[PDB]
Amino acid sequence: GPLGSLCGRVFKVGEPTYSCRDCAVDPTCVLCMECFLGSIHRDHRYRMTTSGGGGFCDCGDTEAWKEGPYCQKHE
Numbered sequence: 001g002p003l004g005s006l007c008g009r010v011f012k013v014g015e016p017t018y019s020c021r022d023c024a025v026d027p028t029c030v031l032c033m034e035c036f037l038g039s040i041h042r043d044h045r046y047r048m049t050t051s052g053g054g055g056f057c058d059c060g061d062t063e064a065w066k067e068g069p070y071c072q073k074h075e
């Protein structure tokens with residue numbers, strides 16, 4: 001997987017991405033669905049944006065999230 005990423009996911013065409021409006025630096029900070037659903041951000045105000053192809057999951061990037069950087073799979 002991409003060097004420097006804990007999750008490793010690169011988004012498929014049509015695959016949902018999740019940015020937490022309450023915690024993300026900006027809308028480019030995203031989680032894949034499995035990371036999002038196992039994260040504290042599932043209860044926050046969020047944005048589901050479908051990837052057009054490409055981009056990558058930011059799970060475990062402690063600079064991307066004001067709180068809750070690791071989902072349960074990546075704890």
Ligand SMILES: [Zn+2]
Nearest residue numbers: 007032035057
């Ligand atoms: Zn992920």
Ligand SMILES: [Zn+2]
Nearest residue numbers: 035059071074
């Ligand atoms: Zn994760």
Ligand SMILES: [Zn+2]
Nearest residue numbers: 020023041044
């Ligand atoms: Zn959040």
